[PDB]
Each structure stands twice: as C-alpha cells, then as structure tokens.
Design an enzyme around this catalytic site. Sequence first.
Site, mmCIF file in Angstrom:
data_model
loop_
_atom_site.group_PDB
_atom_site.id
_atom_site.type_symbol
_atom_site.label_atom_id
_atom_site.label_comp_id
_atom_site.label_asym_id
_atom_site.label_seq_id
_atom_site.Cartn_x
_atom_site.Cartn_y
_atom_site.Cartn_z
ATOM 1 N N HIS B 79 0.832 -1.194 0.000
ATOM 2 C CA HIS B 79 0.000 0.000 0.000
ATOM 3 C C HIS B 79 0.870 1.249 0.000
ATOM 4 O O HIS B 79 2.013 1.230 0.462
ATOM 5 C CB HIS B 79 -0.935 0.003 1.207
ATOM 6 C CG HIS B 79 -2.204 -0.758 0.988
ATOM 7 N ND1 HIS B 79 -3.448 -0.198 1.181
ATOM 8 C CD2 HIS B 79 -2.424 -2.031 0.585
ATOM 9 C CE1 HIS B 79 -4.379 -1.095 0.910
ATOM 10 N NE2 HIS B 79 -3.785 -2.215 0.545
ATOM 11 N N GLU B 81 0.830 4.149 1.601
ATOM 12 C CA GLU B 81 1.260 4.756 2.855
ATOM 13 C C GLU B 81 2.200 3.860 3.650
ATOM 14 O O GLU B 81 2.796 4.324 4.627
ATOM 15 C CB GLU B 81 0.043 5.125 3.703
ATOM 16 C CG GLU B 81 -1.052 4.080 3.708
ATOM 17 C CD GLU B 81 -2.078 4.307 2.617
ATOM 18 O OE1 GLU B 81 -1.773 5.049 1.662
ATOM 19 O OE2 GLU B 81 -3.190 3.748 2.711
ATOM 20 N N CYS B 132 -6.961 2.991 4.139
ATOM 21 C CA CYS B 132 -7.931 1.908 4.128
ATOM 22 C C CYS B 132 -8.303 1.511 5.554
ATOM 23 O O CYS B 132 -7.485 1.550 6.475
ATOM 24 C CB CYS B 132 -7.385 0.702 3.365
ATOM 25 S SG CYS B 132 -6.085 -0.209 4.211
ATOM 26 N N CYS B 193 -4.380 0.104 6.723
ATOM 27 C CA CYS B 193 -3.469 1.237 6.805
ATOM 28 C C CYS B 193 -3.871 2.202 7.909
ATOM 29 O O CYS B 193 -3.010 2.867 8.494
ATOM 30 C CB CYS B 193 -3.410 1.956 5.459
ATOM 31 S SG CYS B 193 -2.818 0.925 4.101
#
Lengths: 383, 383, 152, 151
Positions: B79, B81, B132, B193
Amino acid sequence: PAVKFEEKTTFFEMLREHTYAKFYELCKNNALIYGFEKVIASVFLKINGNLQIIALSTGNKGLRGDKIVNDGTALIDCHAEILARRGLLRFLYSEVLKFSTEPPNSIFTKGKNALVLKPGISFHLFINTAPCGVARIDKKLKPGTSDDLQNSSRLRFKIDKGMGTVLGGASEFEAPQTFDGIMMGERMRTMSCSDKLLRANVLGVQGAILSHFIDPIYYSSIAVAELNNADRLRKAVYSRAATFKPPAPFHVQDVEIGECQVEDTEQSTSAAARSTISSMNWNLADGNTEVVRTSDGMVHDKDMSGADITTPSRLCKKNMAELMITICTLTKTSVDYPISYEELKAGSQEYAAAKKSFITWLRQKDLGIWQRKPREFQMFTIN
Amino acid sequence: PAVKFEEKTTFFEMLREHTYAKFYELCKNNALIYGFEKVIASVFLKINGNLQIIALSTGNKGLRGDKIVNDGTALIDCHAEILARRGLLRFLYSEVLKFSTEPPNSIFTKGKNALVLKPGISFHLFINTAPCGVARIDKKLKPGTSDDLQNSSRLRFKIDKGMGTVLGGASEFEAPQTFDGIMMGERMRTMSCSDKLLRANVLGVQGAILSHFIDPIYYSSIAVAELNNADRLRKAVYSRAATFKPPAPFHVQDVEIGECQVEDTEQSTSAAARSTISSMNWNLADGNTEVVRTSDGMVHDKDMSGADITTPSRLCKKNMAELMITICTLTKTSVDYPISYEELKAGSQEYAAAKKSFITWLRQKDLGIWQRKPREFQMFTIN
Amino acid sequence: TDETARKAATQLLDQIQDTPGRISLNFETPEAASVCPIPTSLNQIVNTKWTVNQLQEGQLTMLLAQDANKFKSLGVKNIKKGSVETQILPRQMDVKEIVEKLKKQDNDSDQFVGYAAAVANVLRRCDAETAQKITQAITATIEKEAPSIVNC
Amino acid sequence: DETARKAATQLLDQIQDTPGRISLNFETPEAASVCPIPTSLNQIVNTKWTVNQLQEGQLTMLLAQDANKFKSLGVKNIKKGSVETQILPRQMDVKEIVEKLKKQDNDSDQFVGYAAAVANVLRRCDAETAQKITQAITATIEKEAPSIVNC
Ligand SMILES: O=P(O)(O)O[C@H]1[C@@H](OP(=O)(O)O)[C@@H](OP(=O)(O)O)[C@@H](OP(=O)(O)O)[C@@H](OP(=O)(O)O)[C@H]1OP(=O)(O)O
Ligand SMILES: O=P(O)(O)O[C@H]1[C@@H](OP(=O)(O)O)[C@@H](OP(=O)(O)O)[C@@H](OP(=O)(O)O)[C@@H](OP(=O)(O)O)[C@H]1OP(=O)(O)O
Ligand SMILES: [Zn+2]
Ligand SMILES: [Zn+2]
C-alpha cells in the site's frame, strides 16, 4: 475420467484413481458427502500385484477445544490421514477376529510372540495433498542455507482452529496441556500430520492397543498427488528419525514415496470446498460410510422426530476400546476388569517403551516437544 | 498542475502539489510508471521554513496468499502509505550512516541512551486518499444499529486478493495465521493502513530494528486530500488510542490532521484506469525509482532480450536486515551471530515491550486482535 | 503405440470403473506387465495361498454375529500397567498447595488460566450452599470492580 | 494587495522549477500570510542545520565510502527470545459472558463454564483492575470457605 499415461508412474496413479473412484461410489449411496473431495486419504492392501482399498477418509480440521470430553467419545483429530489410519486399525481388529475364527482366511499368522502379517501383505497410504506440518512449509527447489532447513524440520503442531500448523520451537510449550486449561480457553495443541506419519513409521501404524495382539505394521509406501514432493516428504516422514534406533521389534520404516505425476490435486484441495465442517470415514471392516462433524468430533443424525441428536463415532477412543474388549471376550483373552484407556495402552510394555524412547530421542535431538493430550482424555473406564 | 486559494490552510496543499510534481518528475526517467498516481503517498522532512520530500510511494494492493516466502524477500504490504514508511526507514538508515561520519551533517545527535532527532526537524506524511479501514466509509457502514458505533473504532484488516476492508473476529479471524495455512488457501490478514498509522503514531515510525540506534520518531502531521475526512481520520489514527500510556521512551503522538481544499478521490485504479497490478516507490536515500509486482512483492525485470528475472525489493525484510548489518559492520557495533530477523526485532527491548503493551491494550479495549503474521515470515537468518 | 500396451491400458482403465478400489495388475505377459511398473522396493513377489478376494465389505459385522464357540484363542493375556503419573482420575482434587498458590500468586502472565482453574477447583469442592454464596460473590465483584467490561 | 502575489509566485515557481523542495517566505508578515502553517507545526529553532545537504542517493555514496572514517556509535545489539505469545484463549463476546456467568446449573458442568467466564472477564481487564478483582475473589473465597481452602 481417470486420465493417465500408463508409463513409469502408473501404480501411484492407480492409487489415486481408485481412491476417487471408490469415493464417488460411496457418494452414490449417501450423496451428503458431496464436496468432501478437498482433502482425502486412503489405505490400500497389496498382494502379489493385487490391490484392495482398506480405508478411505477425508477431513482437514480437528476437535474444538471447548468440545473436549473425558469419556473418549469425541474424535480429537479428523484429518484425512489420521482417520484413514483409524479405519485401518478397525480393519486390523476385524482381521484379528478373522484369524481367531479361521487362521487361513486372515492376513495374520501366528509369529514368535504375536500375530505377524503373512508374506506378501503390504499397506500403502495415499493422500491427495501433502500432510500438514514440515511436508508443506516448503515448496522451493532449494533452501540454500542448511540452518533454515533444520528449523524447517522442527516438530510442528496444529491448533483447534485453522488448517495450518504452528512451529513448536524447542523449550517452548514444555508445560503439559491440562483438561481444565483447555476448557478455560487455552487452545488444544495436536501434532501435525507430518509428525504423526513420522510416528507411524517409527512405532508402527497399529497403535498401542493393537500391539497386545499383533506385531508392528508399517506403511510400505506413502503416495501424494503433488508433482515434486520428493525430498521434502522424505525429510518430513522418514529422514528425521532415520538415525533413530527404536527397540525391538520396532524399526524405522524406509517408506517409499511415489508421486502422482499428472492430475496433481491442488485446485480441488486448496479452494472453495473448505467451507465444509463435516468429515467422513470408510473402511473395509464395516463397509459403510460414516460422516463425523469435526467441530465437536461426533456423528450427528436426525431423530425419529426430525431433530438433531449426537452419538460417538466408531473411530473414537471409547468405540475402539469397546471393540477390543469384544475381541478379547470372543477370543477368550483374560483381561483385568477395572482398567482405563491409558492403562490398557500402557499394558503394552514394548510399545510403551518404544514410544517413550522415541519421544525422549525427539527431545534430545531438539526436533521439538511432542504435544501430549491431557491424561483426562484417556482416564475413562471401559468394560 | 495548478494549486488554488492561497492564504488559507495550504501547507498540506503544497505537500500534495509537490508530491504530484515529484511523481511526474520521476515519470520522465521511467515511463513505465505513468498512470500509477491514483493512490500515492509521500513523506516530507521539515526544518524551519524548508521542506524536502524524502519518501514517495505508490500502490493499493498486497502480497498474494500463494506467493508468500519465508526468506523475507517479498513485500507483504505494498500500500502507498506503507511503502512510504519503508522508504522513510531507508532514509533514516542513510542518516544514521551520515551521523557515523559527519555528525553536523546528519539529522541525528547523540542523546542520553540513543540517537535523538535534531531540534526543529520533523516528518510529515501525505496520502492521496483516505487510509484503508476505519478512515473511510462508502458502503454498508451506515446507521441503523447502535452497535455499529463500536465498529467505528474496531480494528480492520486487508485480505489477499480481496477488496475493501473487513472487520476482525467474525468466525475465522480469531485464530493465529500459519505459513502452511496461508499456503493451500487460508486468507492472509494484514492490518489496515488506518490501524498501521495508529501503530506508527503510538510506537513510532522507525520500527523495531532501527529502534536499536535512534529514539522513536513520530509523524508531526498526516495529510489526506479527501475532504471532510479530517474528523474521521483523527479518530482512526490518534483518538481511539489516545488514552494509551506506552513505556517511558514512547508516547502517543497527537498528529496534526490536515486536508487540501482542492482534491479528488475518483481515482482508485480498481477498473478506474487500467487496474494496475504493480507499484512503485522512491527514496531520497537511494535516489532512484523501483517497481515491484504487488502480487509477489518482487521486482520483475528483463535481460539479454529473453529472460524474466525475479528480484527482491529494496524495501523487503531481507534487504532491510542486510542494510542493518552493513550499518553495524561499518560503525563497528557488534551484533550476535547467528541471529534471525525475528530475534533482531525482538532484540530491541523498549520497542518490543511497547509493541506488546500496545497490542494487549488494543485487545483489552475491545478494539480488536492485531493479526500477527506467521513466525515463518521472519525466521530467516541474517549474515 | 503397441497393440499389447493399448490392450493393457484399456484393461486397467476399465478395471478402474468395473470394480473401484480393487486392482489386478497384469502378469499374464511380461510385456503387458510393463503397463503398471511396480516400484523396485514394492515388487516383492512371493508365493502365497491367500488372495485379495477373500476380503468382504462389512466383515467385522459378520464376524461379530458369529457364535462364541467357533472362536479360538491366541494364548495371550492383558495386564494393566499403572501410569507413571499417579495422580487420581478426576482432577477435581487439585493439589492443595497448588490451588492455594495460583490464588495467592500475582504474576498472571498465564493469562488467568491458572486462576480460573483454581477458582473452578475450589468451587467444585465447596458445599452446594457454600458454592452459591461464592459465585454470586464473584459475580458481584465482577460487576462492581469492572463494569465497563461486563455491562455491554 | 501588496507583496501577497509576489510571495505566492515563489510557491507557484517551486512546484514547477524545484519539485520536492518547498521554501516558505518567513520573517515578513505580508509574505508569511500566503501559506500559513499550523501553530502546532511552528517549531522555529535557530539551528545551524540546513536541508540543502540532503543529497539524493546519499546512501549509495556512504556505502561505497571508505570504512575508516565511519566512527563508532557506541551501541551494541543482543538477541532476545521471540516470546511465543500464541494467542492463548478462545475469545467470547460480552453478551456471551453475561449468560454463562449467570447460569445456576454450574455444578453439572463442574463449574468449568463459570470459571471460563471469570477468566475471560479477567483477560479483557486492565492489569490494575484485573489484579484488584483477583484479590477481591481470593478474599471472598477465603472468607466464605476456610474449610475448603486451609489458610
Ligand atoms: O489420533 P491419533 O493420531 O490417531 O493418535 C491418538 C492420540 O493422538 P491425538 O491426541 O492427536 O488424537 C494420542 O496421541 P497424543 O496426542 O496424546 O500424543 C495417543 O498417544 P498416547 O496414547 O501416547 O497418548 C494415541 O496414540 P497411540 O495409539 O500410539 O497410543 C492416540 O491413539 P488412540 O486415539 O487410539 O489412543
Ligand atoms: O512495514 P509494514 O508493512 O507495516 O510491516 C510491519 C513491520 O515489519 P517489517 O519490519 O518486516 O516491515 C512491523 O515490524 P516493526 O514495526 O515491529 O518493526 C511488524 O512486525 P512485527 O510485529 O512482527 O515486529 C508488522 O508485522 P505483523 O503484521 O506481523 O504485525 C508489519 O508487517 P506486515 O507488513 O506483515 O503487516
Ligand atoms: Zn494435516
Ligand atoms: Zn491502504
């Protein structure tokens, strides 16, 4: 159809083909077992080039921790190979009885001090997938480092929820499992199928109770429907105890592994059908299929009013003990009246000594700790 | 291309504009990563009135279940981040090296017991869209039952080949993950996340291994372009663990939450532009871009006009550990040998205690079970 | 390729369906025997008068239905063996020193399994009148000390 | 409207001329108002440090740099056992606990259910309140049944 080019591998495919062929024949009677082909195992009996399926079973889950019982009426492990071995035990009891009534008709013959298999009899285990534990934690061609290989050979255990196993590192989980603790919430540790097959090839498949009557029986071959499967399965199953020297009559079986070189079962084993919670087992001794709910380890059925009822499985500890007591009472074997399940199992000096030596040797060679169940699992009295 | 409405809160606007400008500048060197900017995150180093981007990353998918590895060569989470945090880790390693030779040039200074960040230097994180998990609600997370207010703070996690984010502990998720379980198709759970940002705000962004040298480093602010998500973003990353009191070197950072006046979230690359599978990341420490396939977490390249080459990412666990040992050898800080990746992370006493306390506190407060990865992911040795 | 090999292959494929689980490998012709190559360690061909077809499904049920007179002995007897662990069969009798210890002790890193086991053990031994006084007492303590955890 | 656009054009130039580096015009209230920073992030310190030396690819140069000039940091790393914190209990919901903590046929289950409920109440409690519940339970046990617990 049974697609295989009949060259250089056929025997193990014939093990694979006849396993599924028998399964669908069982589905013709009870269609309820549809979809259980995800993880299926079977045991074959071989004579002079002739094969006969002895036990067939499926399952990839175990007994839940809060459903444990002290009377031995629940199936602790419901994996395909474990239930195949248990059905093989039931067939062995049937064969011991057959010897007790007509020695010519049975697979056993009277040895020096126990029943011995007749020459030419061999037992072969087939599994549609690699057994859980060491045999599955690696699929790469080479590990490179020898250390990562040796920690990849350490003993592993399953847990009461989930389809994998957890590495039981040395000096960890040395505390014995307790019946109260598991009921309090603690998760029940049960050894992985790879280590159980290692135990089967060290101490025999017949178990402690049958060791009263018969000599140790070993799988002549173990077949898996996975293409490469060669070195990893050897390491998981035989090689870890290849240097072990069990006391007589036990010995480490140099089992042979042959690979189902086509139609390897991965897609039919690793997806979709995992939603099922019921396992089933079939054996030659009874000739009929039995479906066992794995969550509580008992076979359920609808009553005369159409409501759910529960009953112990034929492969449970209590049922096996009752069967063996019936064997003794029919054979006219004298037994002590007040005895427990473990006392009867401890009544085999040779098997108990071999098992203790095997566990202690696993301790010394830091393969790990063998996760023994709480004693209360086997303290129930039968007669 | 054009910012708007200065004289308002626009520092986060400048962060967004410069993240996009840096991404488009990296496009000219590698035309392959065009169109990736749908989900982009970046980390900036701040000093007084000077800003400098030090980590930039892209991606919105993670490692596949059947492509997991045990040697730590695969990126488990890709992901945007998270890869930004990994690039920040590499930059911090470079800064530790710079301190080893040039103390006045590095951002670190010698503290009481570990390297301490220089006064006035701060790190700021920017994300294109909401993280997310908790930070975003689109479907089925709507009023109607008061019990859903608990789900506004409960932990959520990702699933391999899955979409969106699902709540923990429904029927299957209250069980440890197993390497041989994810193999053969158990769904691998990776914390969302939003929850990983909570861990970053509590235990710091430096991670376990880098905590050996430096004191914990926290984001001074987290910027998300998505409008009106600031209240929910603050709840997801700071507020729901505000009452926690970690050990002395750690603290819960009150991260500033900011948003950009001009923004867009329609870009989600899920059938939005081309359904990109691969991801990219850029670190100031390395100075060059890198593309990995999130399906396997590996860098895929070609050579001699005919080959496909699998290569571990610079952000992978193996590369981070190799960089760690290179730093130690260069700085002559002796390390034990043999040592595994798990042992090295567990070697950081303060960070391990803080992480255990944080996970235990999350469990107690009925926020959820932090889904740890199987130990086999980090058992590989480092040399 | 060869007609004999094709015939043997068709034989085995048909045998798969005609009687599932029962196999008869070809041995009437050495060339036809090559259709199913037995492994070298499993090819222990030996002369024996017993045969596969003498196994019947449900034979265990059949043997149990027989009369007890037909059944001969094996000249063996089973003797109990006391387990190395001499603890009594129901672990309701937890060792007194133990159960007092896990109650007085403080380090609950076992995550209260030991304390709960001790509580269950002291509950079991107590009189029914004493047991109920104890368990409403524990209930009241739980609802009074930690109400955020119980009253959802 | 003076110096506001003259300040703004510098920020507008940075996003196109120097991607990734931002300089804010401070020490001028008119110029400082174009991009106000939050007061929580206003950590103005007169450091001798500057951001200009953050060379791209610095890690590559430092690794190929000679090992002689890399002076020691003083710290030293030692392994520690990866505590096998296998998640011990099978968790149960709060609505579940209340019922099983209320049943009166506990003796039929040999008090397994009530003790499990007590354990999972203790498990989800914080250390202070869990310890105080522990002392309270021990006290009421020692008070009600000295005959069974010999103390
Ligand atoms: O279930 P199986 O694999 O068929 O083997 C089981 C059992 O294993 P599970 O607990 O996993 O069911 C015991 O093994 P432990 O786990 O307790 O070690 C037990 O072994 P002990 O009797 O030594 O305790 C015994 O194996 P054996 O037949 O060697 O005695 C037993 O078989 P039974 O279920 O027939 O007792
Ligand atoms: O960078 P992330 O993708 O978030 O990876 C982290 C990281 O592990 P790595 O160092 O391998 O990147 C964590 O480590 P620390 O924060 O402690 O340094 C932690 O690992 P541990 O908790 O095991 O230390 C955690 O792993 P987990 O998910 O098991 O909690 C997680 O890894 P994931 O990417 O696997 O989520
Ligand atoms: Zn298994
Ligand atoms: Zn995300």
